[PDB]
Amino acid sequence: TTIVSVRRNGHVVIAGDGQATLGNTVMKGNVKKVRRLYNDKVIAGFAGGTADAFTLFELFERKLEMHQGHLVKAAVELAKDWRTDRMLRKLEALLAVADETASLIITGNGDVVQPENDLIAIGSGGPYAQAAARALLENTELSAREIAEKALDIAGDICIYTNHFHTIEELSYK
Amino acid sequence: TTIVSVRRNGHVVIAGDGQATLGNTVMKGNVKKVRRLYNDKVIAGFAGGTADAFTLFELFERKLEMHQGHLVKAAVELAKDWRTDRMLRKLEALLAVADETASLIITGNGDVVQPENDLIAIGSGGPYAQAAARALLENTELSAREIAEKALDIAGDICIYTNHFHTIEELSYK
Amino acid sequence: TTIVSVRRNGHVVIAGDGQATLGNTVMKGNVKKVRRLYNDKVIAGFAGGTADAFTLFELFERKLEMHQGHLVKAAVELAKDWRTDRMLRKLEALLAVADETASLIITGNGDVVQPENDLIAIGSGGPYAQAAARALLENTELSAREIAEKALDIAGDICIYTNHFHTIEELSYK
Amino acid sequence: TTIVSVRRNGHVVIAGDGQATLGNTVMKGNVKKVRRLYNDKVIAGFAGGTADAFTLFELFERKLEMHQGHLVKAAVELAKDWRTDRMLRKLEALLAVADETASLIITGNGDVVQPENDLIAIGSGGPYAQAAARALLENTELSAREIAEKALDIAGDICIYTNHFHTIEELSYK
Amino acid sequence: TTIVSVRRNGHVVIAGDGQATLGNTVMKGNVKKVRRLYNDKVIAGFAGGTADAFTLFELFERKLEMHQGHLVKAAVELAKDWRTDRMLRKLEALLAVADETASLIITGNGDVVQPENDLIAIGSGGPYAQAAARALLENTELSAREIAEKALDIAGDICIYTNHFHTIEELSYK
Amino acid sequence: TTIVSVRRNGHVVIAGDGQATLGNTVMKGNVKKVRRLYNDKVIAGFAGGTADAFTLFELFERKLEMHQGHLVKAAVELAKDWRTDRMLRKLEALLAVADETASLIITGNGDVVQPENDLIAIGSGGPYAQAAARALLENTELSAREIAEKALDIAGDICIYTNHFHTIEELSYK
Amino acid sequence: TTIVSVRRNGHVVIAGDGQATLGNTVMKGNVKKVRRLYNDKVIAGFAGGTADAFTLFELFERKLEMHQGHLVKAAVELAKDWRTDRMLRKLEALLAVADETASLIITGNGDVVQPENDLIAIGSGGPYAQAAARALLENTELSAREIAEKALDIAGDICIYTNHFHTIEELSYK
Amino acid sequence: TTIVSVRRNGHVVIAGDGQATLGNTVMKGNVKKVRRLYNDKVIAGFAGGTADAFTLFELFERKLEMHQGHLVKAAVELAKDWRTDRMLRKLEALLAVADETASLIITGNGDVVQPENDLIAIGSGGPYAQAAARALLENTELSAREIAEKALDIAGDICIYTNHFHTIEELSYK
Amino acid sequence: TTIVSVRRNGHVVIAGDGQATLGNTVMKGNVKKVRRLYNDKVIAGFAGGTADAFTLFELFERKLEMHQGHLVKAAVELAKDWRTDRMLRKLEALLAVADETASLIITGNGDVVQPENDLIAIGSGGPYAQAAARALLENTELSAREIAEKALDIAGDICIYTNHFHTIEELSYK
Amino acid sequence: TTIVSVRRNGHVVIAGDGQATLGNTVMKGNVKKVRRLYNDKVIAGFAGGTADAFTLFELFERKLEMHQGHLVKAAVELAKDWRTDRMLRKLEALLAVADETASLIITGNGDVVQPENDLIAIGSGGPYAQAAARALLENTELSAREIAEKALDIAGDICIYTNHFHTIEELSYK
Amino acid sequence: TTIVSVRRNGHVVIAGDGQATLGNTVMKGNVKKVRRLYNDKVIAGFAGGTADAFTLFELFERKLEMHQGHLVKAAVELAKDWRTDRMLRKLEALLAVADETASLIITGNGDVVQPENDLIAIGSGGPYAQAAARALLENTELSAREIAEKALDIAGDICIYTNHFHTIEELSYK
């Protein structure tokens, strides 16, 4: 699995592969690891079980309602309940979410992280995508969609757990 | 890795993928796992280190010279020296070879095997290819090349260690 | 265990083996892993404990009555209660169900999935059946019953946990 | 794998299945686990790698030549060299051999064993065959071939690593 | 441990050994692994801790009272509570039970199973008894008590964890 | 396996069981673990592979020839070559031997041991036999044969790897 | 550790970091993982113990002398001896080497590999460098030295086992 | 991660690195592991999840308000609730805090500790920083800011989990 | 164990602790881990078995004789024979040696290393000593003897395997 | 860690070291592992986490209040709750406590133990202190304080996890 | 096992227990772990297999002959061959030896050690004996025989693997 997020020129995107591996075999190649949330004001992705993310994303929208859509404060309340609750602690996934404000990662250890330049790359292929996206972001004028697309394809050629099926959700705020 | 061999209507083929995995990373995608031997009278493939096969294939040609190209007897002398020699015992690979006579597998345990109907499928994706090749060979009139081609593509979609780069060497005897 | 579902030409079927393994021994070879539900409007299968499926199937009929037989919405409510309830969370099985509308998989992680082309293949032999059913569905005009039948036989030859005892429930809607 | 030996009414037989398992997959179903040795005066079988047995059986014939075909003394010299030699110690297999004199087992630990009533049952399904063969030998007048045949089929129904492909080598001495 | 159940000519029996092993030593040789239940209308046996079975058997009689002695439906409610309850999930045992209606196995995974011909063989020696009982049942007219007795003695000679102390509870319904 | 040696009133004996275990299965119950050596002047037993002892006992007779039947000095030369030779080092067994002079144990570590009161008890059941033989030797006037017999039967009831088949070789010197 | 090789516009380079980690500690930061060979006609790098590479590189020069500097044939003879010799088999390292002809990887499994486009990236940070170098090579006109330099710095920011100390050996052939 | 605190000449400081590691990769290099609390009268740092510290820090300010800013008594009440609460027990972090009164460590085991000389060094690189800060504090007149600065840089050169991004909060009381 | 080497102002020193640990026990506290070599022109230390170093140091003096006292070239010939010889390969130790020319480390992997600034710190406490010696060498004018002394004492307070018994051999060249 | 208790001539003492080890490093050398309880009528020590003991000691004083200071009966109620409560069961420590009545040990297994002569020695170095304290107690007239002091210093020289920092609490009752 | 060596007032002794444990069982209680060597000029003991020591002690006498009885130089040549030879490397034991010159330990790692004050204590009970012998040697005028005797008895009371059977070899030189 690989998921990438890039932010440039008033645009931010999240892209991810569709591969679902079981042991050494491919279970499903068209998985939708990216979706929109909170009245399509937020984009998010996940690396892990599909139901585990749908549970976390739904609660994340409830934390946004309590905090009026504030991304960072809702992300900490989600990470707080995630490590806390005995039921949520069992969940195993790597969340990625972003809005016009900023991009950040969420984890089951309770750690909330905003990468340098708001460049997120997670999953088994994440480090590979981060090395490609860091190269284009500094040496090209390409739009964030073009970077996340080409970076994800490079990670699929490298990572055996990632494929070239793609799903993207751009957000323009300019 | 996946390699397939099919024999039908006076034709026999060997096909294999080009993927070379290192851990969870793709090292090389265009590997040539198939080649010809003994004045292009024999086709063969291998699953494992490239050099380990080049050593075994060279000696296999010499065993053919001593036995005047007899495939079965040369394969046993290769399997005999393979398990015996302290040098060759360190080699780890799965050989596949065929001629107009018959198809058979060779292993580092010394085991020489001719599959039912001379249908070989080896590598990490081998069982997946055997399941598809078995379905077409009984339910279709397709030529051995068409079966090995479609079977290898299905194994690449399933096996994470197999890709869709292909190399084939057909042998027509009619 | 292996279970297959195919949909073609107004017909959809579910087929599964009868093998029940205990460690390295065969406990029972004639297990009925397929049955009908909801006034015989729905066919379903299961890989796992017999009682765990009978509990999930009965509740699944309940969810269908609340949703007037809607397959997708009832499957979500079942996956919702499955992950949620402390009693149901202990259950371990892989459900497969289909109607004239569509085919989909249900899991104990809460994940509801509809495969490409509505081709389901689950159990320890599932990937082997998917490889064979994928080959026939694209390369032959065979009916969905003939594909699930031949595919399950190939999976039994390959998988050691699968046998050739078969149970099928076709549904014709045309 | 399962192999059985029965001796009755001047007749002795060795029967074994053809299944070759790789992990949870069936690699080959028609394996010949039984053969004849020393001018067809001796029958033998093996559970393990095919070449490991071909090496041990060849040397066993040489031990018979030095001891003029004496089964027991040659079996001890084989078991002596087997545990002794650094090359032979790496071999892993379970040998079964018999002649008109007596039946006995040979192992890689150096242990030579002649079962009660000269009833051998080895392999992963061996104990299952021994329980069936013990039942018929005491409660029926069936010939040793009929017992080994029916016993091996019962072991294939129970053991997942054993199948119903059969190979037999009877020896009549009366 | 070994337990056997046979059904023939209007008779059904359950037999089991008395051996209780602790590591490599025999703790007790006269254990009663068989008993009667529900007004002596039901016979049952268990492989595992003695108290774990006495707990399961008592609840099984309560499930029979709720279901008016129906064997199958009460067995599923027992298997349902067994996997469900946090206290019952800790229990580790293999139940065997039968009445004039049918014989079936119960497990801690929630799996309810009725073997072919209602022939049950469980415990460490179970597969050995199943191979002997299958031989006599097809090749002899022996009564179910005679088969379970001789089959259990064969399993005790083979299994090191089984002994020849025996306890039986026959049920005649004709 | 269990082997016992007792010396009393001018008499010394060696007794051992016949059980040969393979995993959790009984391979052979009538094994002869006791025999005579050096013109019936010496009695000996072994716990381990049959052939491994026949090799060590043969060489032990040769060490007796060089030392004119001296038990202790020949036992050290055997223990010396046992740990030294690369061939003999692979042997795994526990030897027990005695004559009119004294009783002692020999091991593959090279250790030669004479127990207190020349009471030997080896094998998986050895400690159990030593506990019973120690009780009778101090609290009864029973002859060494009666002690080794009753002690070995008690070890067979306790040890699962030991059975009640017995083989004895007494030596009277008075 | 990270090492990169790039070939463009008649130029080829090999670059690597200087970090040497011991557990969670940095042992040395200025390690020279790159050097020249065969009269400065060949450049090479290594990931692993420093002396393990100095031994392999010395023998690699000798293989070049026997083959008159042929890179591919000498690399196979090195990989052949590497897996073969009992002394060389103990060595653990990942070699990278290139000349004006082509670039290729060598491994202790005997596997010789030439990556797509002759782009090598090995070490714990190798996949990260490959994702960055793949991005620049397709989207920029930068020289091979500029790509390997920027790619190695990105891998040092990501990999914890890689640092920004650099050593490079360019080869111009035009 | 590494965090250091030094107190000298009426001044006390807390310094920490910005590295955030995920497995063997760097997630974020500019993490702010140091901040001020209680109307900027208190400085504190944390090693662990960002949100877990923000929760503990907020509660720590609460305990300070109940105890009128007393550092020691508030730290005990925080350590008391930390071990006690089922929610807070799940939190995993290492807190460091100091004021003009004294410096002390807090842990999830409930242990409150004041180091010798009020020298705190925590995180994976903590012992390395303590070794360097101990050397300068005794052998130099450097101010506490200069010691924590140079000590944290040395820990980043050694620890692979620590980097040279720095955040400091000095407190002057004189 | 800890050993330190420092070079300053025409002076170079080697210091090491005397602790010898066996498991969790102190075997000897006054071990001399430092000594002089080659007519007192060279100082050296070792971390490991006492005899293993005495063998390597003796041969190192012979390599100096062949190379006329050249430190670097003799160290490579020692590292060459160390990994090569089957006898020397079994030795396990970490050597440290220095003369007026330069300081360097030698290892059993064959790796010869000269640290930055010729600062050596090895043993279980080596990294702790390097952290303290690095702090004083840059922030103080202290002589190399004073640095190695204070650094080794700090490593003994931290490392549990290091104590405060000291042995030093200075070399003045100015 | 090491803790010692000695009782002589109307005096009883408890002494313990200050070392706190983390892996192979010393975390803190001045730990106070000894303290007084119940109006300074009781002395106690602990080996383990500091907070775990402060929890157990506080509850132990409450058990003394319910039992009017009776040492033994309060120790059993503490050991009873310790094994019982799900929260206290997680605690890991070795308690030592004494009064004018008697000395005894308490454990997390629920075991209450009073050593011979009321001589307690616990911790990783406990057995070493017990061997020294047993020597002086029988062969010298030294007071209990002198024995616990010299015994603890001997354990610190031997145990690597124990140091020479000491804390003592004597109780005189005469 | 426990072995002690003490040197005082022109006398030196070596004492050891007779216990030989197999798992949780006592194999032999009267083992002689102490003996004399080199014309009764040297005393020695061993912890480990009896024959492993007899081989090492024999070669140790040969090293003494080559070095004219020099204890230290012969001990290094023994430790050199011990780690070196492929045969001797397999031996596992802890040697203790002393003469009028000095006492020292020898190990299979090649480490030669002379304890402080020439006080050796090895075996599983060694540290317990060292703590008792250290107490008496400083606080009493007792002779070395009295110290080793009382120290070994205390170690047998503490260590479960040590008993009170004793063997001593004193050497007087005055």
mmCIF file of C-alpha atoms in Angstrom, chain A residues 18 26-31 163 165, chain B residues 157, chain C residues 5 103 105 113-120 130 134 137-138:
data_model
loop_
_atom_site.group_PDB
_atom_site.id
_atom_site.type_symbol
_atom_site.label_atom_id
_atom_site.label_comp_id
_atom_site.label_asym_id
_atom_site.label_seq_id
_atom_site.Cartn_x
_atom_site.Cartn_y
_atom_site.Cartn_z
ATOM 1 C CA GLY A 18 -5.811 -0.111 -4.895
ATOM 2 C CA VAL A 26 -3.224 -10.131 -4.434
ATOM 3 C CA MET A 27 -6.692 -10.106 -2.884
ATOM 4 C CA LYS A 28 -8.121 -7.058 -4.687
ATOM 5 C CA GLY A 29 -6.569 -4.521 -7.047
ATOM 6 C CA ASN A 30 -9.229 -1.792 -7.249
ATOM 7 C CA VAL A 31 -9.499 -0.860 -3.567
ATOM 8 C CA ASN A 163 -0.086 -1.349 -7.778
ATOM 9 C CA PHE A 165 -4.662 1.536 -9.733
ATOM 10 C CA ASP B 157 -2.105 -10.389 -11.424
ATOM 11 C CA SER C 5 -19.463 -17.386 -7.110
ATOM 12 C CA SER C 103 -22.568 -10.343 -5.403
ATOM 13 C CA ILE C 105 -18.176 -10.570 0.331
ATOM 14 C CA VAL C 113 -16.531 -5.943 -0.833
ATOM 15 C CA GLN C 114 -17.967 -6.490 -4.300
ATOM 16 C CA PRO C 115 -15.309 -8.113 -6.537
ATOM 17 C CA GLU C 116 -14.569 -7.094 -10.093
ATOM 18 C CA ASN C 117 -17.226 -8.654 -12.334
ATOM 19 C CA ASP C 118 -18.902 -10.016 -9.168
ATOM 20 C CA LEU C 119 -16.410 -12.910 -9.095
ATOM 21 C CA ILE C 120 -16.026 -14.196 -5.519
ATOM 22 C CA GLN C 130 -10.211 -17.166 -8.838
ATOM 23 C CA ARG C 134 -10.922 -15.727 -14.408
ATOM 24 C CA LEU C 137 -14.928 -16.345 -17.960
ATOM 25 C CA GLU C 138 -12.831 -14.378 -20.457
#
